[PDB]
């Protein structure tokens, strides 16, 4: 996590006016989860304003609002089973500065979303 320049997820199967696509962004206000379909860019840099990640919406099926996801570690698990998407999380300070330390930390589920769309790829934003 540290200096970050992270957060921003773009999932989906197709890349051209087909199916839908998930989108998760953190802005210290709301972790919005828009399944709405748009077109995108290569490296859309928002914030400090400008907003040009999406291109055009057609129609959407889910809108969500929840609380923000806050030597640390930013750990997530994204898993989909029979139309239910599950995103887990964990955040804990560590002493080692090198790599993943030696220890155990289970993941408390944060949300369950019934959607029912097949997914094949994803990309991280900055």
């Amino acid at each position: 996590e540290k200096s970050n320049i992270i957060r921003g997820w773009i999932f989906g199967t197709t890349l051209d006016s087909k199916t839908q696509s998930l989108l998760i962004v953190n802005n210290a206000t709301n972790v919005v989860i828009k399944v709405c379909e748009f077109q995108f860019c290569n490296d859309p840099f928002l914030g400090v304003s400008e907003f040009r990640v999406y291109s055009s919406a057609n129609n959407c099926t889910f809108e969500y609002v929840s609380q923000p996801f806050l030597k640390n570690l930013r750990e997530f698990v994204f898993k989909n089973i029979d139309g239910y998407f599950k995103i887990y999380s964990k955040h804990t300070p560590i002493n080692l500065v090198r790599d993943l330390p030696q220890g155990f930390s289970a993941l408390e589920p944060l949300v369950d979303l019934p959607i029912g769309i097949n997914i094949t790829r994803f990309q991280t934003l900055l």
Partner: protein, 50 residues
């Protein structure tokens, strides 16, 4: 063609608002339901709980 609506027109030609609601069959996780029950609670008795 435009309707002709007047307050003095006949009841058959009077405007009527019709709303038709249609629900799709069970092919996806259920998203619409309703309040079933609002019963109270008891303690230290033999009861059937749901």
């Amino acid at each position: 063609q435009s309707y002709g609506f007047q307050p003095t027109y006949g009841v058959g030609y009077q405007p009527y608002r019709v709303v038709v609601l249609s629900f799709e069959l069970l092919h996806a996780p259920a998203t619409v339901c309703g309040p079933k029950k609002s019963t109270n609670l008891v303690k230290n008795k033999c009861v059937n709980f749901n």
